Amino acid sequence: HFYLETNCTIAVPKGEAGEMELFVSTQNTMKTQSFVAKMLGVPDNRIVV
Amino acid sequence: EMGQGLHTKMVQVASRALKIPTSKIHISETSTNTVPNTSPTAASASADLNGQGVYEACQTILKRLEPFKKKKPTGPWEAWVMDAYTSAVSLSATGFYK
Amino acid sequence: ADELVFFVNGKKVVEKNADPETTLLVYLRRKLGLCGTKLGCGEGGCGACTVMISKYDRLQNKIVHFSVNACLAPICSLHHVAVTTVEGIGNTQKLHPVQERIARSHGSQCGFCTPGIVMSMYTLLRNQPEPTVEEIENAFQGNLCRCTGYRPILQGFRTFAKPSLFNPEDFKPLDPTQEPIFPPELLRLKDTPQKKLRFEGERVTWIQASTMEELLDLKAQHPDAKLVVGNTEIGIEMKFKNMLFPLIVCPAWIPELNSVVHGPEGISFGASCPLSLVESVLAEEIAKLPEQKTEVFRGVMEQLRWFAGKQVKSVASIGGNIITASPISDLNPVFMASGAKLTLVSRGTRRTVRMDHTFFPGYRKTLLRPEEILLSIEIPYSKEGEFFSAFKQASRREEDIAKVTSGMRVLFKPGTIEVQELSLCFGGMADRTISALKTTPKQLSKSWNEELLQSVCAGLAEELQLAPDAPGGMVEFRRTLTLSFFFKFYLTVLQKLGRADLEDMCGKLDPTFASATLLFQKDPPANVQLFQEVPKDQSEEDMVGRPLPHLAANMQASGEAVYCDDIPRYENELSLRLVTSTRAHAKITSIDTSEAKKVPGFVCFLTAEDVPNSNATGLFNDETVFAKDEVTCVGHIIGAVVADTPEHAQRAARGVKITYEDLPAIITIQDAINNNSFYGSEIKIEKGDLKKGFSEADNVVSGELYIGGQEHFYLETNCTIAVPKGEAGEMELFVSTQNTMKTQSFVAKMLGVPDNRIVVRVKRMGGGFGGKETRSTVVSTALALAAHKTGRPVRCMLDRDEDMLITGGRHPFLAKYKVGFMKTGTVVALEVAHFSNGGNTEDLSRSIMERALFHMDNAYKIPNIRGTGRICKTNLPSNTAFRGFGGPQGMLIAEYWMSEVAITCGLPAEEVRRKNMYKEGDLTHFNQKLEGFTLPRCWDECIASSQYLARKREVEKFNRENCWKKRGLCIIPTKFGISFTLPFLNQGGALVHVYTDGSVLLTHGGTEMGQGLHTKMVQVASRALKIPTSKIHISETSTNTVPNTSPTAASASADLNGQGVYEACQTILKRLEPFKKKKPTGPWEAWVMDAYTSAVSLSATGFYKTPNLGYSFETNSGNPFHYFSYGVACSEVEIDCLTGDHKNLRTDIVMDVGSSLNPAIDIGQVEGAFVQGLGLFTMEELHYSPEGSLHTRGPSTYKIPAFGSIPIEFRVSLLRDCPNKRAIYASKAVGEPPLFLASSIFFAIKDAIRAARAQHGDNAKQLFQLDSPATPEKIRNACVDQFTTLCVTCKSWSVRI
Amino acid sequence: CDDIPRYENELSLRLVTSTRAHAKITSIDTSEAKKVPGFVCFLTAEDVP
Ligand SMILES: Cc1cc2nc3c(=O)[nH]c(=O)nc-3n(C[C@H](O)[C@H](O)[C@H](O)COP(=O)(O)OP(=O)(O)OC[C@H]3O[C@@H](n4cnc5c(N)ncnc54)[C@H](O)[C@@H]3O)c2cc1C
C-alpha cells in the first residue's frame, strides 16, 4: 500500500468500567472496537474508536 | 477520510439536501459513539452509502423545520432554527441507508 | 544529606530535589499521578485530601498509623514515613470493606468527599479494629460532605461498631492480616541513627533538625529560621496570606520536644507533641486519677473536643498553638487561667515562666526572644478547693474558629467558700488572649454568692468593652457570652462546692438551673427510612423502583472515578489563573505586568484586548469576559495569567498590579432601593381585592424579614480543560458544569467561531447545586481563550477562596409583609414586597424572583393576595441558581408571617396552618389548579408518625422544668412547582446505540453531579428495552451527541431525559420486533445480530418536551408547572439560652416523590436537600466588608453542616400509593423540594426562643424578630435576660447586604 | 494521529516479531530488555485478559 502515514494507534484508558478511547489511523472503526473489546473481555459500549 | 475527499463530498451532499451553504456545515471526525456498526471505508462505496445516510438525516431535519419555513418563507435559516428550538423541536437526527 | 525518601502505597519514592513548598497532595496528584486524593479547600477544613501515614515511632518503639491532611503536609516533613492513599487499600477489582460499605450503603453521591472519608474510617480501623459508634462519628470531625446529609455514611459504618435500602449481611468481613505490610526497609532504617537533612527549593530552604543542639545552634546563628512542626498554621500563612519564610527548620524529630514527663505539680509535654498525644495521655490521667486533681486536664479536654478533626490533631503541636498566639486560640486561655509553666531555651540558656498576660504582649507576639524556642508546657494538677471550667462558642460545634473562648479558675481558702485566687481568661475579645485583671482582684476574700455573681458580671461588662469596628463584629453577642460563660462557671462552682459538703454555706442549686451546667452530650442516633416495595410480579431485572446504588459508587469509594482535574495533563499543557478586582466599583487606570513577566514559566496576561470576537457574555449578555475600563465588584475578573504550572501562575498573578480610581458603589439592597438600581421592572402577582380583605380582617400584622444568601460549597470547585485542535477553530472542553450548551455557545461567541466547532464534555461533577448552571462559564471562557491563543491545552481549577469570591451564591432576600386574618387564624389578605440582591450581572436573578413569587403562598389558600419582587443591581459578585431557585426564600417569608398569625390568635400553629391549607382542586394565586394534591396525606402521616401532639406536651413540660435550656417543636408543609419557569427549557434529548455484541451505549443531555441521574436513566432504559441494567452503559454527556440541551436544573432532569431515553428505546424496540416475532425466545443478542445482518439501523435519537406550559404575568393565566411536589417535616430542637448553641434532636419527613424511580437515591436527595436547608436557615452566613469585599472565603469561616449537625433522630418516609402518571414511570422530581422543609428547624428554634423570652424577658416584645440564618448570635441575642441587659451598649467590620 | 500531543504519563509500545516463517517458540529471554532505561514491560499471550 505504502500509505505515507503508517499504522498508528493511541489508546487512552479512562480508569472506570473498562472504558477506553482510541485514536487510530484506520478505515474500520467497528472491527477496531470489536477486536479491542473481545481481547480485553469488555462490552463494545466501553470502547470508543 | 483517507485522502479520497469523502467528508468534502458529504458536506456538498448535506448542503444541497438542507439548501444552506457548505460554510455552515462541519465534519470533525468519525467515531463509534456517534455512528455505530459501520462498515469499513472500502469497496469504493463509502460516498454512495454515507451520502444516502446523510441525505436522509437532512430530510428529517427539513421535515421538522417545514412549519417554521411555511410561517416565515423568506426569513433566514437562523430564524427557522431558533424558532424550532424555542418551540422545543428536536434539531438532531440519525440517517441510515442499505 | 538531601535525598528525601518515603513510601507511597508500599512503593519507594526517592526525591533528589525536594522543594519545601511541595505539599503531599500536589506530589501525589501531579508527580505520582494518584488522583484519588482530592483538593476541596487547601485549608485543612474539608478532609477531601485525607491520607494515612505509618512510621516506626522510636520513642514508643512500634509501628504507628495516623491520618493527615495531604493539602498541608510538606513532603519535606515525611522522610522515612509510609503513606497510604485510597488507591493503597483496594480498588473496584478488590474493594476494601470500608470502600464496599460506604458505596453499598448509599454513602457516596457526587463522590468527591468519599476517598477522604474512606481514609478517615480506614485509619480508625487500623488503630481500633472494634470502634464504638461514638469513635466512628469522631473520626469525621475533619470531613465534610455536601450531598449525603451524612446519615448513610454513619449507618453503613455502624456495622464496624462493637424493605431495606441495603443489606449489611452481604458485606464481606474484615481480615486485618491482609492490610499492606509496613515497608520492611523502613524497619531496617530505625536502627541507623537519624541525621540532619537540608532541602533546597526555588525559594525556600528546609532543615530537618536531628538534635536539640543543632536546632539551638541554627536559631542562635539565624533567628530568622522559621520553626515548622505540623504546618497547620504556617501552611495557611504561606498559601493564603502569601508569606514566604526562606529558611524553615523542622524540629519534629527531636526527642526532647516529644517527651511526656509526670512530675509533682503536673504533666510536662514537649512542645512538638501533637494534640492527639496530649489528648490520649490526659484521657488516661483523668480516667485513673482523683477528680480533685484533674480539673485543668478536663478543661483542656473540653476545648480539644471541638478543636478541628483527627487529621489536624495528629500533627498540630501544643507548642504551635501556644506560639501562634492567635486571639482565638482555644488553648491559651486555659493555659493562662491555669498558670501553666513554659520552659524556653536558646543555645546555652534556659528560663521558666508561668503563662500570664505578659506572655502575650501584642498581636501574634510572645515573650520569646528571636533566638529562643519553646521546649515544654507543664499542664498542672488542680488542688483541693480549686475548680476549672473551659468554654468555647463558635458558629458550629466541630472544627470551627471560636468567637469567644475562655479558661476559668477559682481557688477557695481551705474549709471556706471564700475566694483565695480567681482567674478569668478570654480569647476572641481582643487582639490577644487577655486576663480580666481589673475584675478578678476585687473578688478576693469574697464568699461565692449572688453578689459575687453581680460584681464579676458588672466588672466583665466594663473591662471587656468592644469597639463597634472590632474585627469580627457581633459585639453584643460576644459580650453577652463573657457574662453567660461566667454564669455557667458560677453555677458549676456552686455545684462542685455542694459535692465537697459545703451546700449549707453556698446553698443548693435550684433544680431548674441544673441543665445550665451540663457538658455537651448527644443521644445515640436513631434513623428510619421507609419506602414502598415494588410489586411482587415485577421482574427481578426491572430495577425501576428498586434501591439500586449509584452506578459509580464503587469507583468513587476507590478513588478511580475521574473528575476534571484528575484527567492527566498533556505534556504541552499550560495553567491559567484568574486576576480579579479588589474594588467594588472603580475605573481601571492602568495595569502593570512587570513583576508578572519575571516569574519563571510566565506565558502571557490575557485582558479584554485579546478577545477575538465579543467581550459580551452571560445569560443576558450584560457581562464582560474580561473587565474593560471599569470593575463592578470585588471578584470582577480583569484578566488571566497563563504559565507552565499552577504555582507559577499564582505567583505571576500576584505580580499583576492594578491601579484604580473609585466610583460610587451600590452594595446593599437599601443602597439599590435609594439609587433606583434594579434589573428590569417590578414583577407582580395579585388576585382578589386587597382593600376589602384588609377591611374584613379582625387583625392585621406588618413586619420585615431578612434572609442571608448561601455558598453552594460543591466539594469540587469550578474546573475547565480546553484542548485546541489546531484546525478550523475546533476545540474540546472538559468542564465541571451543569450547562454544556451555554458553555459551548459562550466559548464560540467569544472566539467568533460557529457552535459546530466547539465540543463540551462532562463526565461528572463533584456537586453543582445550581452554582454550575451558568457561573462555570466564567472560567471556561477564559481557559478557552488561553487555549486558542497558545495553541496548547490549558487548565484551571479554582481554589476554594477564588471560587467562593467569583462565582456568587443564593440570593439574599428582604421582604416587607402585611397579613390580614380572622381570630380563627384564617388569613384573608396578604401583601408582600420582595427584594433580592442580584449583584454584578442579571444571570438568573429575574427567574429566581418569579419562582419566589410563585411560592409566596407555600401551602396556603389566600383569597386576596398581592406579591411584588424587585431585583437589586449591585456592585457584588453576581448571584445565581441554588437548589430551590427562589422557592425557599418565598416560602420562608410565608411561614414567617404564618408563625405570627398563630401567635397573634393564641391558637396552635399546627391548627392554623392546617385550616389555611389548600384543598384538592383549588387554584393558586397564579390560577393553576392543584390536582393529585397529596399534601394533606403527607401532613396527616407526618403528624401521626412523628407523634407531634404527645411531643408538644413533653416540650411544654421540659420548658417548665428548665430555665436556661428550652425546646421547640414545629411541623412545616411545602408545595414546590416542577418545571423551568421558561417553558421551552422543558425539553430533553437522548441518543442510543446498540452494538453487535448486544451492549447498549446511552447518552442524554443531563449531567451527573451526584444526584444519581445516570443511574436512573439506566434503570429507565433497562425497563424500556427489557434487558438487564448490566448491558447498558452511560459514559458521559457531550454537546456532539445531544445538542441544544437545557441545564441540569429545576429538579427536572430525570423527568426530561427519562422521557427522551424511553422514546429512543421505543424506536429501537420497534425496529427489533420482526426479529423478536421470528425468534420469541432466542436471546436479545440474537435479535440484535439478526437486525445488523439485515441492515437495520441500531442507533436512534429520542426527544421530549413538557406539554401545555406557559404562564403569562399579564393575564395571570396558563400553567407554569407540569405538577407539584409535596412534603412535610416535623423538627424538634433544644437551645442553650446562655450560648445560642442548639441540638437538632429529631426530624421526621414525609415526602411525595410519586412512584420513586429509585428510593435509595430519592431518600438520599431528601436528606441531602434537607441538610443544605438546615445550613441555609441555621449555620451558613456570608460576611462582606462595607466596601463589598467577601470576607468569608473558606470552611474556616463558612460553616456548612458537619456529621455532628444532623438531627440525632432522622426519619424519612416516601409517600406510598401516589403514582404521578404524567412523569416518567409515574415518578416525581426530588432534588429541590425537600430543602425548604429544614424550615421546620428554624421555626422550632423560634418556638424555643419564645419560651426563653417568657421565662426571662421583662415586657419582651411578643412578635420578636428572627432573621435567617438563625445562628448562635441571633439565637443568643433574642434570648433577652439579665445578661443581655448589661451588654446592649457607623464604621464597622461588615454590612448587611 | 502521531501529531496529537502526548499526555505527560504516556508510554510507547514496540512490537516484537518472528524472524522465522514457521517454528515453535522454545523460549523467550527478556534479560537484556529489562536493562534498557525506561523499560516498563513485555506483553505476551499470557497478558491477554
Ligand atoms: C482545620 C483547622 C482547624 C483548627 N481549629 C483550631 C481550633 O479550634 N482552635 C485552635 O486553637 N486552633 C485551631 N487551629 C490552629 C491549630 O491548632 C494550630 O494551627 C496548631 O496547633 C499549630 O501547630 P503546628 O505544629 O501545626 O504549628 P506550625 O504551623 O508548624 O507552627 C506555627 C507557629 O508556631 C511556631 N512554633 C512551633 N513550634 C515551636 C516551638 N517549639 N518553639 C517556638 N515556636 C514554635 C512556628 O514558628 C510558627 O510560628 C486549626 C487549624 C486548622 C488547619
Ligand code: FES
Ligand atoms: S483539601 Fe485538605 S482539608 Fe480540604
Ligand code: FES
Ligand atoms: S457525596 Fe460527599 S461532597 Fe458529594
Ligand SMILES: [Ca+2]
Ligand atoms: Ca445575578
